[PDB]
């Protein structure tokens, strides 16, 4: 059973409206499903959008933010809870402690570093929580091509690759995450 | 001036000999250039290969390894120094403290998480040390395609993208790293 889902997403909104539409769909879907949203606690970009959609639909939202970037990404004032921690490592360790699964929406280097960090923690045996990509147009196509290449070239085992699910529908991706097994 | 270079690379050797050839070329080139190699301190895979090539050519090598994975990746016994630290975060923080620049050889999820983590630290203003991709065949082509897309879609600023240089020649990449500017 999933009870809460951690979402990583851009602090920018992105160059076209499709990104915000995907964030809205996902926030709304999490709430409708009974799941708590865990996220970086910002009000900027897709972070703000996914929290707002979760809240508009009645969902619980917990934001996790380092002290050092409260003003930069604008700590969201209308969350169920906003947890302010000591630094970047603490933030990711806490989001993981509260989540049953992880979803990456489109984002930048921060979204990607979070995804990869948490993926390695599964690789190293610290958790067995599944990760997912919410696909928006062909945003992630070249990343998936690259990750599959890592398995062909034998830098990543198949079972480690298989921790990352993917879907363009929030419902179908959440189903894949809820059913996935080590 | 570069005095020391941190290398991230696979703990696997990879499915074909080209990867080991690139690691050998890079280790040998670092040593010939007078640069200290900083790396994860393993004797497995491309990690072992790049340290051995640096050492065979007379270079200094410093390995940085968490306590918890000494047996797993085989702490290298013939380094200038092997520093054993408390955990994963400590390892990356220490490699960064000792390096003037970062190079990613081909690798898996660990190589990628390290690259992305250190890249964000530049993004957040903690350092201004350049990063580089050593290109081996078209290994990184789809990653570069994806990263460029992040800038087109406005999830990453151009100046943040520009912290990552790239080359197939160790000499040309090291020149790009030594000359790069914020
Ligand atoms: N090393 C890191 N650890 C934790 N959070 C980070 C790190 N780097 C960036 N972030 C955050 O991730 C969020 C999403 O980043 P981005 O996808 O680059 O817009 C940013 O607002 C950053 O504050
Ligand atoms: N989160 C992490 N922090 C530091 N090192 C890591 C992490 N995940 C994996 N590694 C290391 O990076 C090395 C290269 O990994 P790979 O590229 O997956 O073969 C591995 O041997 C791991 O011990």
Short mmCIF file of C-alpha atoms and ligand atoms in Angstrom, two decimals:
data_model
loop_
_atom_site.label_atom_id
_atom_site.label_comp_id
_atom_site.label_asym_id
_atom_site.label_seq_id
_atom_site.Cartn_x
_atom_site.Cartn_y
_atom_site.Cartn_z
CA UNK A 1 0.00 0.00 0.00
CA UNK A 2 1.12 3.58 -0.77
CA UNK A 3 0.16 6.10 1.92
CA UNK A 4 2.45 8.97 0.89
CA UNK A 5 4.38 9.94 -2.23
CA UNK A 6 7.40 12.17 -2.53
CA UNK A 7 7.44 14.40 -5.63
CA UNK A 8 10.54 16.06 -7.11
CA UNK A 9 9.92 18.73 -9.72
CA UNK A 10 11.33 21.96 -11.07
CA UNK A 11 11.49 25.21 -9.16
CA UNK A 12 10.86 26.74 -12.64
CA UNK A 13 7.54 26.38 -14.40
CA UNK A 14 9.13 25.34 -17.74
CA UNK A 15 8.86 26.92 -21.22
CA UNK A 16 5.42 25.64 -22.09
CA UNK A 17 2.07 25.08 -20.29
CA UNK A 18 2.21 21.23 -20.56
CA UNK A 19 4.45 21.01 -17.50
CA UNK A 20 2.02 22.88 -15.26
CA UNK A 21 -0.84 20.76 -16.62
CA UNK A 22 1.06 17.57 -15.67
CA UNK A 23 1.76 18.93 -12.18
CA UNK A 24 -1.86 19.85 -11.66
CA UNK A 25 -2.99 16.41 -12.85
CA UNK A 26 -0.60 14.68 -10.47
CA UNK A 27 -1.32 16.82 -7.39
CA UNK A 28 -5.05 16.40 -7.96
CA UNK A 29 -4.67 12.68 -8.54
CA UNK A 30 -2.63 12.15 -5.33
CA UNK A 31 -5.26 13.93 -3.25
CA UNK A 32 -8.20 12.09 -4.90
CA UNK A 33 -6.44 8.83 -4.16
CA UNK A 34 -6.02 9.51 -0.41
CA UNK A 35 -2.22 9.91 -0.62
CA UNK A 36 -0.11 12.47 1.22
CA UNK A 37 2.14 14.59 -1.00
CA UNK A 38 5.72 15.02 0.24
CA UNK A 39 7.70 17.66 -1.64
CA UNK A 40 10.40 20.32 -1.28
CA UNK A 41 8.05 22.84 0.33
CA UNK A 42 8.41 25.67 -2.21
CA UNK A 43 5.81 27.93 -3.73
CA UNK A 44 7.79 28.52 -6.99
CA UNK A 45 7.45 26.73 -10.29
CA UNK A 46 6.07 23.22 -10.55
CA UNK A 47 6.64 22.76 -6.81
CA UNK A 48 4.03 25.46 -6.07
CA UNK A 49 1.73 24.06 -8.79
CA UNK A 50 1.73 20.42 -7.53
CA UNK A 51 1.23 21.47 -3.86
CA UNK A 52 -1.62 23.86 -4.80
CA UNK A 53 -3.38 21.18 -6.87
CA UNK A 54 -3.04 18.68 -4.05
CA UNK A 55 -4.44 21.22 -1.56
CA UNK A 56 -7.29 22.48 -3.82
CA UNK A 57 -8.45 18.87 -4.03
CA UNK A 58 -8.31 18.37 -0.20
CA UNK A 59 -5.06 16.38 0.01
CA UNK A 60 -2.53 16.47 2.77
CA UNK A 61 0.76 18.12 1.78
CA UNK A 62 4.04 18.06 3.77
CA UNK A 63 6.85 20.34 2.53
CA UNK A 64 10.51 19.71 3.44
CA UNK A 65 12.85 22.72 3.12
CA UNK A 66 16.43 23.52 4.20
CA UNK A 67 16.68 26.66 6.34
CA UNK A 68 19.08 28.14 3.82
CA UNK A 69 16.59 28.33 0.98
CA UNK A 70 13.31 29.51 2.57
CA UNK A 71 13.38 32.91 0.86
CA UNK A 72 14.86 31.59 -2.42
CA UNK A 73 12.09 29.07 -3.17
CA UNK A 74 9.42 30.73 -0.97
CA UNK A 75 8.30 28.38 1.79
CA UNK A 76 4.64 27.62 1.10
CA UNK A 77 2.39 29.12 3.75
CA UNK A 78 -0.74 26.91 3.20
CA UNK A 79 0.60 23.35 3.66
CA UNK A 80 -0.54 20.78 6.19
CA UNK A 81 3.00 21.04 7.45
CA UNK A 82 6.26 22.69 6.41
CA UNK A 83 9.33 21.09 7.99
CA UNK A 84 12.45 23.19 8.04
CA UNK A 85 15.63 21.16 8.31
CA UNK A 86 19.39 21.63 8.59
CA UNK A 87 20.71 21.48 4.97
CA UNK A 88 20.35 19.63 1.68
CA UNK A 89 21.23 16.13 2.86
CA UNK A 90 18.77 16.39 5.77
CA UNK A 91 15.99 17.43 3.34
CA UNK A 92 16.34 14.39 1.10
CA UNK A 93 16.81 12.00 4.06
CA UNK A 94 13.54 13.32 5.57
CA UNK A 95 11.50 13.20 2.34
CA UNK A 96 12.59 9.57 2.00
CA UNK A 97 11.68 8.71 5.61
CA UNK A 98 8.14 10.03 4.99
CA UNK A 99 7.54 8.58 1.45
CA UNK A 100 6.47 5.08 0.27
CA UNK A 101 7.44 6.05 -3.29
CA UNK A 102 9.05 8.76 -5.39
CA UNK A 103 7.83 10.50 -8.53
CA UNK A 104 9.89 12.88 -10.69
CA UNK A 105 7.93 15.43 -12.71
CA UNK A 106 9.98 17.47 -15.21
CA UNK A 107 12.57 19.71 -13.57
CA UNK A 108 16.24 20.65 -13.66
CA UNK A 109 19.47 19.59 -12.02
CA UNK A 110 17.96 19.57 -8.52
CA UNK A 111 15.05 17.31 -9.57
CA UNK A 112 17.60 15.00 -11.25
CA UNK A 113 20.08 14.91 -8.39
CA UNK A 114 17.26 14.01 -5.99
CA UNK A 115 16.03 11.24 -8.26
CA UNK A 116 19.47 9.76 -8.71
CA UNK A 117 20.36 10.04 -5.01
CA UNK A 118 17.27 8.23 -3.85
CA UNK A 119 17.70 5.66 -6.65
CA UNK A 120 21.21 4.82 -5.37
CA UNK A 121 19.91 4.44 -1.84
CA UNK A 122 17.71 1.61 -3.22
CA UNK A 123 20.68 0.27 -5.08
CA UNK A 124 22.70 0.21 -1.82
CA UNK A 125 19.93 -1.54 0.11
CA UNK A 126 18.76 1.36 2.32
CA UNK A 127 15.18 1.15 1.05
CA UNK A 128 13.07 -0.74 -1.40
CA UNK A 129 10.77 2.05 -2.39
CA UNK A 130 9.95 2.34 -6.11
CA UNK A 131 10.65 5.48 -8.22
CA UNK A 132 8.71 6.81 -11.17
CA UNK A 133 8.94 9.23 -14.07
CA UNK A 134 5.86 11.24 -15.01
CA UNK A 135 6.35 11.59 -18.76
CA UNK A 136 5.34 14.88 -20.29
CA UNK A 137 5.51 14.81 -24.04
CA UNK A 138 9.00 13.49 -24.88
CA UNK A 139 10.72 15.37 -22.08
CA UNK A 140 12.29 12.29 -20.53
CA UNK A 141 12.73 10.25 -23.77
CA UNK A 142 16.46 10.90 -24.08
CA UNK A 143 17.01 10.21 -20.36
CA UNK A 144 15.26 6.86 -20.69
CA UNK A 145 17.30 6.08 -23.78
CA UNK A 146 20.46 6.82 -21.72
CA UNK A 147 19.37 4.77 -18.71
CA UNK A 148 18.57 1.79 -20.91
CA UNK A 149 21.99 2.11 -22.50
CA UNK A 150 23.51 1.88 -18.96
CA UNK A 151 21.94 -1.59 -18.67
CA UNK A 152 23.08 -2.65 -22.20
CA UNK A 153 26.57 -1.55 -21.42
CA UNK A 154 26.40 -3.39 -18.05
CA UNK A 155 26.90 -0.38 -15.72
CA UNK A 156 23.54 -0.92 -14.10
CA UNK A 157 21.92 -4.31 -13.22
CA UNK A 158 18.42 -4.98 -14.67
CA UNK A 159 16.85 -5.21 -11.25
CA UNK A 160 18.30 -1.76 -10.38
CA UNK A 161 16.95 -0.31 -13.65
CA UNK A 162 13.54 -1.81 -12.83
CA UNK A 163 13.15 0.34 -9.70
CA UNK A 164 12.28 3.25 -12.04
CA UNK A 165 8.76 2.96 -13.49
CA UNK A 166 7.33 5.43 -15.95
CA UNK A 167 3.97 6.65 -17.28
CA UNK A 168 2.28 9.66 -18.87
CA UNK A 169 -0.97 9.09 -16.84
CA UNK A 170 -0.78 9.83 -13.08
CA UNK A 171 -3.21 6.93 -12.41
CA UNK A 172 -1.22 4.35 -14.38
CA UNK A 173 2.13 5.43 -12.89
CA UNK A 174 0.73 5.31 -9.30
CA UNK A 175 -0.64 1.82 -10.02
CA UNK A 176 2.85 0.74 -11.24
CA UNK A 177 4.47 2.19 -8.10
CA UNK A 178 1.92 0.59 -5.77
CA UNK A 179 2.37 -2.82 -7.37
CA UNK A 180 6.16 -2.85 -7.96
CA UNK A 181 8.25 -5.57 -6.19
CA UNK A 182 12.03 -6.14 -5.40
CA UNK B 1 45.42 26.26 -12.31
CA UNK B 2 44.26 22.66 -11.75
CA UNK B 3 46.28 20.79 -9.11
CA UNK B 4 43.90 17.87 -8.50
CA UNK B 5 40.98 16.29 -10.33
CA UNK B 6 38.19 14.19 -8.93
CA UNK B 7 37.07 11.31 -11.17
CA UNK B 8 33.73 9.49 -10.94
CA UNK B 9 33.44 6.26 -12.90
CA UNK B 10 31.77 2.88 -12.82
CA UNK B 11 32.50 0.17 -10.29
CA UNK B 12 31.83 -2.15 -13.29
CA UNK B 13 34.21 -2.37 -16.20
CA UNK B 14 31.43 -2.06 -18.84
CA UNK B 15 30.43 -4.42 -21.68
CA UNK B 16 33.23 -3.54 -24.07
CA UNK B 17 36.97 -2.73 -23.86
CA UNK B 18 36.56 0.96 -24.95
CA UNK B 19 35.64 1.99 -21.40
CA UNK B 20 38.83 0.58 -19.88
CA UNK B 21 40.86 2.19 -22.68
CA UNK B 22 39.32 5.59 -21.85
CA UNK B 23 40.05 5.12 -18.14
CA UNK B 24 43.64 4.17 -18.84
CA UNK B 25 44.07 7.18 -21.13
CA UNK B 26 42.68 9.53 -18.50
CA UNK B 27 44.62 8.14 -15.51
CA UNK B 28 47.83 8.24 -17.54
CA UNK B 29 47.08 11.74 -18.78
CA UNK B 30 46.40 13.09 -15.25
CA UNK B 31 49.69 11.73 -13.97
CA UNK B 32 51.70 12.99 -16.99
CA UNK B 33 50.20 16.41 -16.42
CA UNK B 34 51.26 16.64 -12.74
CA UNK B 35 47.69 16.38 -11.40
CA UNK B 36 46.56 14.42 -8.36
CA UNK B 37 43.73 11.95 -9.00
CA UNK B 38 40.92 11.99 -6.43
CA UNK B 39 38.50 9.08 -6.75
CA UNK B 40 36.26 6.70 -4.78
CA UNK B 41 39.17 4.52 -3.64
CA UNK B 42 38.00 1.20 -5.13
CA UNK B 43 39.93 -1.47 -6.95
CA UNK B 44 36.90 -2.71 -8.98
CA UNK B 45 35.87 -1.76 -12.48
CA UNK B 46 36.88 1.53 -14.05
CA UNK B 47 37.76 2.88 -10.59
CA UNK B 48 40.58 0.30 -10.30
CA UNK B 49 41.60 0.92 -13.92
CA UNK B 50 41.91 4.75 -13.64
CA UNK B 51 43.82 4.56 -10.30
CA UNK B 52 46.20 1.88 -11.66
CA UNK B 53 46.92 3.93 -14.81
CA UNK B 54 47.56 7.02 -12.74
CA UNK B 55 49.92 5.07 -10.45
CA UNK B 56 51.75 3.19 -13.26
CA UNK B 57 52.58 6.59 -14.73
CA UNK B 58 53.87 7.98 -11.36
CA UNK B 59 50.86 10.11 -10.41
CA UNK B 60 49.57 10.78 -6.96
CA UNK B 61 46.23 9.10 -6.20
CA UNK B 62 43.95 9.77 -3.20
CA UNK B 63 40.99 7.40 -2.71
CA UNK B 64 37.93 8.40 -0.66
CA UNK B 65 35.78 5.51 0.64
CA UNK B 66 32.92 5.15 3.16
CA UNK B 67 33.65 2.61 5.90
CA UNK B 68 30.54 0.70 4.89
CA UNK B 69 31.78 -0.26 1.45
CA UNK B 70 35.46 -1.19 1.90
CA UNK B 71 34.91 -4.89 1.19
CA UNK B 72 32.24 -4.30 -1.49
CA UNK B 73 34.39 -2.16 -3.80
CA UNK B 74 37.77 -3.39 -2.45
CA UNK B 75 39.74 -0.51 -0.96
CA UNK B 76 42.83 -0.11 -3.14
CA UNK B 77 45.99 -1.05 -1.26
CA UNK B 78 48.57 0.82 -3.46
CA UNK B 79 47.33 4.46 -3.37
CA UNK B 80 49.23 7.48 -2.13
CA UNK B 81 46.45 7.69 0.40
CA UNK B 82 43.12 6.00 1.09
CA UNK B 83 40.81 8.07 3.29
CA UNK B 84 38.04 6.18 5.01
CA UNK B 85 35.10 8.36 5.99
CA UNK B 86 31.76 8.15 7.77
CA UNK B 87 29.16 7.51 5.00
CA UNK B 88 28.16 8.53 1.48
CA UNK B 89 27.63 12.24 2.05
CA UNK B 90 31.02 12.55 3.79
CA UNK B 91 32.72 10.85 0.80
CA UNK B 92 31.40 13.29 -1.78
CA UNK B 93 31.98 16.33 0.49
CA UNK B 94 35.64 15.25 0.92
CA UNK B 95 36.28 14.51 -2.78
CA UNK B 96 34.99 18.01 -3.52
CA UNK B 97 37.15 19.64 -0.82
CA UNK B 98 40.25 18.05 -2.42
CA UNK B 99 39.40 18.61 -6.15
CA UNK B 100 39.78 21.68 -8.43
CA UNK B 101 37.58 19.96 -11.03
CA UNK B 102 35.41 16.92 -11.67
CA UNK B 103 35.43 14.43 -14.54
CA UNK B 104 32.82 11.72 -15.13
CA UNK B 105 33.98 8.68 -17.09
CA UNK B 106 31.24 6.22 -18.08
CA UNK B 107 29.57 4.53 -15.11
CA UNK B 108 26.19 3.77 -13.58
CA UNK B 109 23.78 5.34 -11.13
CA UNK B 110 26.50 6.10 -8.57
CA UNK B 111 28.68 7.91 -11.14
CA UNK B 112 25.58 9.89 -12.22
CA UNK B 113 24.37 10.76 -8.74
CA UNK B 114 27.85 12.06 -7.87
CA UNK B 115 27.99 14.17 -11.01
CA UNK B 116 24.57 15.65 -10.45
CA UNK B 117 25.17 16.28 -6.74
CA UNK B 118 28.38 18.17 -7.29
CA UNK B 119 26.81 20.03 -10.23
CA UNK B 120 24.00 21.32 -7.95
CA UNK B 121 26.53 22.44 -5.38
CA UNK B 122 27.90 24.76 -8.10
CA UNK B 123 24.39 25.78 -8.95
CA UNK B 124 23.75 26.69 -5.28
CA UNK B 125 26.97 28.71 -5.01
CA UNK B 126 29.02 26.35 -2.80
CA UNK B 127 31.84 26.09 -5.34
CA UNK B 128 32.77 27.26 -8.77
CA UNK B 129 34.65 24.21 -9.89
CA UNK B 130 34.01 23.02 -13.46
CA UNK B 131 32.71 19.52 -14.35
CA UNK B 132 33.45 17.45 -17.43
CA UNK B 133 32.25 14.43 -19.37
CA UNK B 134 34.83 12.12 -20.91
CA UNK B 135 32.97 10.93 -24.00
CA UNK B 136 33.48 7.33 -25.00
CA UNK B 137 31.90 6.53 -28.30
CA UNK B 138 28.29 7.79 -28.04
CA UNK B 139 27.85 6.69 -24.45
CA UNK B 140 26.85 10.12 -23.17
CA UNK B 141 25.11 11.36 -26.39
CA UNK B 142 21.58 10.83 -25.10
CA UNK B 143 22.45 12.39 -21.71
CA UNK B 144 23.79 15.49 -23.45
CA UNK B 145 20.70 15.62 -25.63
CA UNK B 146 18.59 15.53 -22.42
CA UNK B 147 20.64 18.17 -20.61
CA UNK B 148 20.41 20.52 -23.58
CA UNK B 149 16.66 19.99 -23.63
CA UNK B 150 16.59 21.11 -19.93
CA UNK B 151 17.98 24.48 -21.08
CA UNK B 152 15.55 24.74 -24.05
CA UNK B 153 12.67 24.02 -21.77
CA UNK B 154 14.02 26.58 -19.25
CA UNK B 155 14.58 24.22 -16.27
CA UNK B 156 18.27 24.97 -16.23
CA UNK B 157 19.95 28.39 -16.84
CA UNK B 158 22.60 28.54 -19.62
CA UNK B 159 25.33 29.48 -17.21
CA UNK B 160 24.49 26.40 -15.07
CA UNK B 161 24.56 24.18 -18.17
CA UNK B 162 27.95 25.66 -19.08
CA UNK B 163 29.60 24.29 -15.93
CA UNK B 164 29.66 20.87 -17.68
CA UNK B 165 32.34 20.65 -20.38
CA UNK B 166 32.84 17.61 -22.55
CA UNK B 167 35.51 15.96 -24.73
CA UNK B 168 36.60 12.59 -26.10
CA UNK B 169 40.35 13.47 -25.64
CA UNK B 170 41.64 13.63 -22.03
CA UNK B 171 44.00 16.49 -23.02
CA UNK B 172 41.29 18.63 -24.63
CA UNK B 173 38.81 18.08 -21.78
CA UNK B 174 41.46 18.97 -19.12
CA UNK B 175 42.29 22.13 -21.09
CA UNK B 176 38.55 23.06 -21.12
CA UNK B 177 38.31 22.46 -17.36
CA UNK B 178 41.48 24.44 -16.61
CA UNK B 179 40.30 27.39 -18.66
CA UNK B 180 36.58 27.46 -17.76
CA UNK B 181 35.18 30.61 -16.02
CA UNK B 182 31.97 31.53 -14.01
N1 LIG C 1 21.93 18.92 -3.70
C1 LIG C 1 20.63 19.23 -3.46
N2 LIG C 1 19.95 18.70 -2.41
C2 LIG C 1 18.66 18.96 -2.13
N3 LIG C 1 17.93 19.79 -2.89
C3 LIG C 1 18.47 20.38 -3.97
C4 LIG C 1 19.87 20.15 -4.33
N4 LIG C 1 20.12 20.87 -5.44
C5 LIG C 1 19.01 21.52 -5.74
N5 LIG C 1 18.03 21.23 -4.87
C6 LIG C 1 16.65 21.73 -4.86
O1 LIG C 1 15.80 21.04 -5.82
C7 LIG C 1 14.85 22.01 -6.28
C8 LIG C 1 14.48 21.67 -7.71
O2 LIG C 1 15.58 22.09 -8.52
P1 LIG C 1 15.49 22.27 -10.10
O3 LIG C 1 14.97 20.93 -10.63
O4 LIG C 1 16.94 22.52 -10.47
O5 LIG C 1 14.63 23.47 -10.30
C9 LIG C 1 15.56 23.38 -6.14
O6 LIG C 1 14.69 24.47 -5.80
C10 LIG C 1 16.68 23.23 -5.12
O7 LIG C 1 16.55 24.01 -3.92
N1 LIG C 2 24.62 8.04 -2.90
C1 LIG C 2 25.93 7.73 -3.11
N2 LIG C 2 26.94 8.46 -2.56
C2 LIG C 2 28.25 8.21 -2.73
N3 LIG C 2 28.67 7.19 -3.49
C3 LIG C 2 27.78 6.39 -4.12
C4 LIG C 2 26.35 6.60 -3.97
N4 LIG C 2 25.73 5.66 -4.69
C5 LIG C 2 26.68 4.90 -5.23
N5 LIG C 2 27.90 5.34 -4.89
C6 LIG C 2 29.20 4.80 -5.29
O1 LIG C 2 29.59 5.20 -6.63
C7 LIG C 2 30.34 4.11 -7.18
C8 LIG C 2 30.12 4.08 -8.68
O2 LIG C 2 28.82 3.54 -8.89
P1 LIG C 2 28.30 3.00 -10.30
O3 LIG C 2 28.53 4.14 -11.28
O4 LIG C 2 26.84 2.73 -10.02
O5 LIG C 2 29.08 1.74 -10.53
C9 LIG C 2 29.80 2.84 -6.47
O6 LIG C 2 30.79 1.82 -6.24
C10 LIG C 2 29.14 3.27 -5.17
O7 LIG C 2 29.75 2.79 -3.96
#
